[PDB]
Symmetry: D2
Subunit: 484 residues, 4 copies
């Protein structure tokens, strides 16, 4: 017997919903990864029907002629109900239409909240008081952002946790659903090559890079509200840091992994204001199209704003394994390229017998694009040479696994929610630690309004970040020559 | 000022000379790697000329029409003198011919002995008493084999050492001149990734593989005399074992490296008779041409001989780093392929959290063919899967350094002799140790005449070697699937 | 301001109360370690008075004539109330009495349940329903034993946890109050000489020894119900194992330490019945007094009882640090001495160059008697010798800290309860793991009624225990000679 | 058959001879450690007899009334021969006299050189040309000092080595004869508790302490020539450093240990002049006897002498195990006490959770006086405390082996020479490295004549040495309180 499963999309008319969630679940249904008895009901304020959302989301489905029959099946399993985000009567109407399905009750309920944070409290309280299943399990899915600082996020976290247990809250951080972020755990805890060397005795510094080649591109209101720190460094870089620095769990269970992650987070001290470089981008006079406009050009930006579009922050995990090793979290929009990269720079080899010609090893795990694990090792120079040179032991997903499709992060996250695996989600304690690490710095920046170092659009950011990276021990040589 | 260097070929008419030496030195001179004032004198019993050896060695030079001018320069710097290996008059004739050359006096003689071992004593004593330069450095080069057992090799080694200083003997083991064998030092002494894990605490067993897809093909008299053990295991496999198991040298100097190599050799006990698997090949019923004949189907092989064409022997290096870890030296002619491979099977990951789906990691360093370093590591299965699968971090010479021509071993060895580097050459004491481990086993086999396990030509050798591999610790699963 | 503290003792007329708790609180008050406004309330079914319990507990105070004034103050701060363990009226009578003090409302109430396990239900429920302070904190204290198996302990733990939070439940395991047992953490996580070597890579086996030189001596009825396993191995030896094998906590907070302990408990597999040696003592024919009778020679012991007074059980902690290392928990009553010992036998030194004259090093931390930490180390033989003998690096409390007094465990435990430090107390999940490790073994023993190996009173128990110890990896030599 | 052995003491009338070598050989013969065919021949310029040497060396024998008969036996096996150190005729006369003894031809001759270094060249030349046994082995024993700098030591070492083989030259460093110095090898290579932590990953700095409570005491003419560096630092402290830092030998043979020691020597760079603190003691104005006079208050010391009687020198071993760890060699005469001590200060425990109360562990080995090995550990404060404090795991020889008399170093050195064990003797290459480490510093000090920091007699030397120790990483706290 296959239990009935139901997927609910809040704000089904929303941008995020029609842009990512509906294509994600359609792709998952195309591969048959959901249980056989799966229904989908949309919910928003807009008075739409299944046909309206269908024609709105079809261009994002990436469908081909071979899958019409499955497409009409999928939209025969879809539904929509209109209502408000605070009127209960809409929620009893939704529940009445909700039970009117096959097996509708024993069904395992599942809610996705693709809504602005300003309505999270009301939506979650109404779902708790009205849309709770009596037989199957109920799992609610919240979305980034989670508050603005320690207290603002803490009040929301306590409001949600007071309503649902920790096994029913699924905080989405879609980089945790990436292929390489998951592969971090298997590389760390399934290989003896990477076991003894994963400590402060060998690792000089850890660099987690996040770059984007475009700016806010005319949508500067929300970025002005938040900043690059709150957007990326608080969640994406910090989860990659937790996966990198976590201790070996007792098992592969979600609770053990999240306990290790929160234990690692608890060992991080406050972010000092002398370890942070902020940058804001201005238009490139020789750029193309959007490259000629800066962050002060976007009208969606109040005049004279100090919001930074780049940041390089050092974190220290004070524990027996990571004491003294800097964790350089450098992220920034409007940079020269797109790259999510985990770079562990190892210490110099003890007793260099190669006359200072050797350089630091760098295990690099590029999350996106071109998923690949390569360790920058020192091999002997091929030919009639004896001095060593930097090479790599490369494993690229795209040259070794061409015939397999690395799925989208949302697909895997939703599949994990369906299967009950909560390993790749943010816990309340982990969120509290993540917010308390950065809250003093955010408050200091908000109250003081510093001047971020200007950096031209499309450049590699302010040089002050590079000065910081050199200062905190990271060594950059620029002698690494790589050819595909 | 560049000192004159003279290359000397004993037995210049020999097969080894015309097939490997003259092409090697021609390639070295073609790239300008030899000193500008370089002359070459040939010596053998046959009364030949420069033109005769020229036309004999032309098919092996791999010459090109644009290289013709350099070819005539090369053969203008060549000369030939005939004589006897026992008559001194020929030796002072050669010396006088040398003195009639560009500053012969201050010239740096360099001797090569491409002769059968039966004349090494006489040739070396005559060279010492008649052919020594009074100004520049003098170095001789002796060739495999080095005796037959401990005492037979010891007498020759003492005779040579009593005549020449250890900075003058250059014992050729051309597998030391291979690209990957020399790289072994860089891989482990220039990387912090391979340092902490290079011990008995992480390595379960070490396998050194040497395979040949072909048999002896009418040259079976010498192989019947020797046996695969003293052919390949005493020198090639054992030197790869020394380089794998050596300690970190104080410097890249030759003497230091040879010191740790002999130190590691001194920690190996002699071979027990219960750790040896021996095989003799018989023709394949459905073979092709040469494959239809066995080792006993060769007319020059004496009838009813028990000489084996395959050997898998387990060695133990009882020291603080290699105590208890087997060193399975598996070699065999008439096997299914050609491969020189160094395989380190690491221990099972402690506290397996992936439900025994992980398998032992293996750093594999394939010397030839298709030089490549790949660590068989456990990565997460790409796509909608969570169990790990075997993969590799691959660095291949040919896909990364396709424009770089990896030279022949003899080229690099002769260049090392010219440059005075003795790092990749056999010193007397590690030769004595290497013969010490294997001599009792060779004597026991010679006296007892065991029966080697018959294995079909072109097969993977006897299954008893695989049984030994399982018995001593090595784990084989056969689930590794690799695509280029 | 010093808040009022009230120490309420259930079963004030009890044996354990009068012989251990009243002397403990009197000693704590005599040294001035209690808050100034501290009062003690007695409670039991007996209609005793303050003077009655006073004269009953004088002989166990070890009081002195010069302390008469402080003793009079102590008993001026004492009180007693008679009542029932299930009648609520007595509970609000105690509440009204306790409130009728100085600050008898803002007081910090502290309860000790020195009662048989059969009344924990009623006492806990009545205390929760009637005897809570609305201003100060309220902490309850429970005592060994905790059930008989997994389910019996689970029901009691769930009932207690359903009424009190984990910061208000204080589970007493007086071996956690021992000096060496708490010093284990400082040995492990504060010294760099015991950190790198505290893993499976250097430890051959782990032995925790518990010995008593006397049998049940006339109380065999109580011991027959439980057995030595449930008496010692489930709590004392197992918590010693947890403190030995625990990973380094994030901080010295109680929650971190208990989380590490329960994490280590989660990694222990269930006890197989092939690693248990049960023993029942038989009367020594030439003993003195009590030694002439066996376990079956006691009137209150049921006839034909196969209860074991000795046990040696091997535990395996399947994790990264303790994979494969056996954990022999050897306990036994009527043995040859009284001794609680933590013995860590290290592996043989790899690459032994002393001609097998060396033996395994042993880290010993003797909890009692004569608290001492010594490492059975290999030093060179003093005098005109070159071979090593087995010696020790001894730190003995009594020769180094003679002038300081070693306090009783209950004293420091009660002081920790007063200070709110819950570091050395058992958590509920720790009980669940400690009981699930042993429950199938105890159930199978109870069902099958096996036959314990008889051993003479005053001997060292069955020799099958020694056979098991040598089988699982422990090497006993008997060559260790020690002189005081 | 017991081969005859002959003990020859060159300069038998010398100060060192009658103070140390005659009582040493007498003690060795008293205990029957010598072969029963043992004879002793003296030689010097003085025209003394057996009775004269007897009456001169009796007070230093420490004889007792019960061993006269042993004294008459010993002096019946004693003989004296007069002659010169450059006249051959005396040497053939000695050869004739010493052959004219039982088995005076197969006897194993063994020579001791208790002579000033100015005559070593002539004495070794004559003894090689005239007094060599043609049947039994011959071993020559030399004494400190070995030259004054690199070239002065090299010339004498080459002269000695050009006449005798390395298995016959026995260079005396009587500290290598000390109990603790030899025991260092058993500490390191026979214990699993001191092996893993014996590297740069756990050791912060190394201090080798040598202190003397008395000045030059009227022998300033000899000490002015050399200085404290050449006196103790070049040999005693540095050989202790070599034996502490050495890699584990392949076997307990002498050549393996000596090779490891010279390998460690080869990894040390020349001594820079910015890490050397020199001190010259001056008279304490309130001293007693010799404490009231300084090094300038001794008539035989040349006026205006800048020779240093104290030195703290920082050494680095650039190898895989000791990279970055400073080696502080702090030695000085006229200090506050007498002490030879090996102190290894370990790094701070990473991720300290005890709020900076922990301090660096210090493995301390006191060579003399009161031989003891103790590791300064951090244990919990006994009693009603929870903070850790400094303690030690103490093994003191005098409390554990009080009935075992630790023999003099010269006794064991002579017994080693008799037995052929050359483990504890200095090699020529060892001397070369030891001298090239310090030679540039000594030459610079001689050429520029610095001014050492004055320090009063009986003090702990200049405070600049303490400043240097603090700067190079050593953390002195002064809070370590020890009670016997
Ligand atoms: N692939 C290889 O052949 C190979 C590989 C590695 C090592 N080696 C070693 O290198 C050496 C080169 O010899 P080879 O392989 O080229 O075989 P080879 O042709 O039989 O010997 C080479 C030359 O040595 C002379 N020679 C042969 N037999 C002799 C004998 N009984 N007495 C005196 N001189 C004799 C001959 O000089 P003349 O022509 O003037 O008469 C012959 O031309 C051999 O020792 C071989 O073991 C060979
Ligand atoms: N406690 C120590 O003094 C001590 C400790 C360790 C090492 N050493 C070393 O051991 C060696 C023994 O010397 P020592 O301490 O006993 O002092 P020493 O008395 O001056 O030298 C002992 C012998 O040296 C001879 N001698 C004296 N002056 C000489 C000169 N100009 N030329 C040649 N020979 C001369 C004398 O031979 P005659 O009596 O026959 O004339 C005397 O017997 C010295 O090199 C010293 O560095 C000494
Ligand atoms: O501790 P010991 O054995 O007395 O060593 C001290 C002596 O050792 C010698 O090497 C020095 O030359 C002397 O100056 C010093 O007094």
């Amino acid at each position: 017997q296959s239990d009935t499963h139901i997927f609910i999309i809040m704000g089904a008319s929303g941008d995020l919903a029609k842009k990512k969630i509906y294509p994600t679940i359609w792709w998952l249904f195309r591969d048959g990864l959901l249980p056989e008895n799966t229904f989908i009901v949309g919910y928003a304020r807009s008075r739409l029907t299944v046909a309206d959302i269908r024609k709105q989301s079809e261009p994002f489905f990436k469908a081909t002629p071979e899958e019409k029959l499955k497409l009409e099946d999928f939209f025969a399993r879809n539904s929509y109900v209109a209502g408000q985000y605070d009127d209960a009567a809409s929620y009893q109407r939704l529940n009445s239409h909700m039970n009117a399905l096959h097996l509708g009750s024993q069904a395992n309920r599942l809610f996705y909240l693709a809504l602005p944070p300003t309505v999270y409290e009301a939506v979650t309280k109404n779902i708790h008081e009205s849309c709770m299943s009596q037989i199957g399990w109920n799992r609610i899915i919240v979305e980034k952002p989670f508050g603005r600082d320690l207290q603002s996020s803490d009040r929301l976290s306590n409001h949600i946790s007071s309503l649902f247990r920790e096994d029913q809250i699924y905080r989405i951080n879609h980089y945790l659903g990436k292929e390489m972020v998951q592969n971090l755990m298997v590389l760390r805890f399934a290989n003896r090559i990477f076991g003894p060397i994963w400590n402060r005795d060998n690792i000089a510094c850890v660099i987690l890079t996040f770059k984007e080649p475009f700016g806010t591109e005319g949508r500067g209101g929300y970025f002005d509200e938040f900043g690059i720190i709150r957007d990326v460094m608080q969640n994406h870089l910090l989860q990659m840091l937790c996966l990198v620095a976590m201790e070996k769990p007792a098992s592969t269970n979600s609770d053990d992994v999240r306990d290790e992650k929160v234990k690692v987070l608890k060992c991080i001290s406050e972010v000092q204001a002398n370890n942070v470089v902020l940058g804001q981008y201005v238009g490139n006079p020789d750029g193309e199209g959007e490259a000629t406009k800066g962050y002060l050009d976007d009208p969606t930006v109040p005049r004279g704003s100090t919001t930074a579009t780049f940041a390089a922050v050092v974190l220290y995990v004070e524990n027996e394994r990571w004491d003294g090793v800097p964790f350089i979290l450098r992220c920034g929009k409007a940079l020269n390229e797109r790259k999510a990269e985990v770079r562990l720079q190892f210490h110099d080899v003890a007793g260099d017998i190669f006359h200072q010609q050797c350089k630091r090893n760098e295990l690099v795990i590029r999350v996106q694009p071109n998923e690949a694990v390569y360790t920058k090792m020192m091999t002997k120079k091929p030919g009639m040479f004896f001095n060593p040179e930097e090479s790599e032991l490369d494993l690229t997903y795209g040259n070794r696994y061409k015939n397999v499709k690395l799925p989208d992060a949302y697909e895997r996250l939703i599949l994990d929610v369906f299967c009950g695996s909560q390993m790749h989600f943010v816990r309340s304690d982990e969120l509290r630690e993540a917010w308390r690490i950065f809250t003093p710095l955010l408050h200091q920046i908000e109250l003081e309004k510093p001047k971020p170092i200007p950096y031209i659009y499309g450049s590699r950011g302010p040089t002050e970040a590079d000065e910081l990276m050199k200062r905190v021990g990271f060594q950059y040589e620029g002698t690494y020559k790589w050819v595909n």
